[PDB]
């Protein structure tokens, strides 16, 4: 409602740009619950190298509980193309949206906008 994030998403400075809308930590499967069946997942790619498959294992956990599924991606790495390609293939099968940010503020913006 006024968002629900996972306490496993703390630390992440993107929460610092979630200023225009109210948000709070809740125990939910996805990273952010934005509506009764809309939910997002954050994957900082740079971290994507450091132990990946987690984003893959993260979508199977979510399964199908939310209608609008979205993947917030922070492009914090040069020459990202390669990964985006294999991540996108994953999203069509998972039928979730692929969104691209490049800063912790930009993604933070993407959150105020989906609840707005």
């Amino acid at each position: 409602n006024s968002i629900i994030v996972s306490p496993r998403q703390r630390g992440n400075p993107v929460l610092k740009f979630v200023r225009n809308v109210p948000w709070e930590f809740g125990d939910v499967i996805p990273d952010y619950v934005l509506g009764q069946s809309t939910c997002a997942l954050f994957l900082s790619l740079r971290y994507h190298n450091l132990h990946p498959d987690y984003i893959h294992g993260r979508l199977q956990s979510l399964g199908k509980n939310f209608a609008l599924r979205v993947l917030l991606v922070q492009v914090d790495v040069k020459d990202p193309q390669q990964a985006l390609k294999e991540l996108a293939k994953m999203c069509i099968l998972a039928d979730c949206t692929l969104i691209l940010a490049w800063s912790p503020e930009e993604a933070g913006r993407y959150l105020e906008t989906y609840k707005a």
């Binding site: 998403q9 630390g11 990273d31 994957l43 900082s44 740079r46 971290y47 994507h48 450091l50």
Partner: peptide, 11 residues
């Protein structure tokens, strides 16, 4: 610090 926990995000 550098304690990358879990959550698709570098820490």
């Amino acid at each position: 610090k550098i304690i990358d926990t879990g959550g698709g995000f570098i820490l």
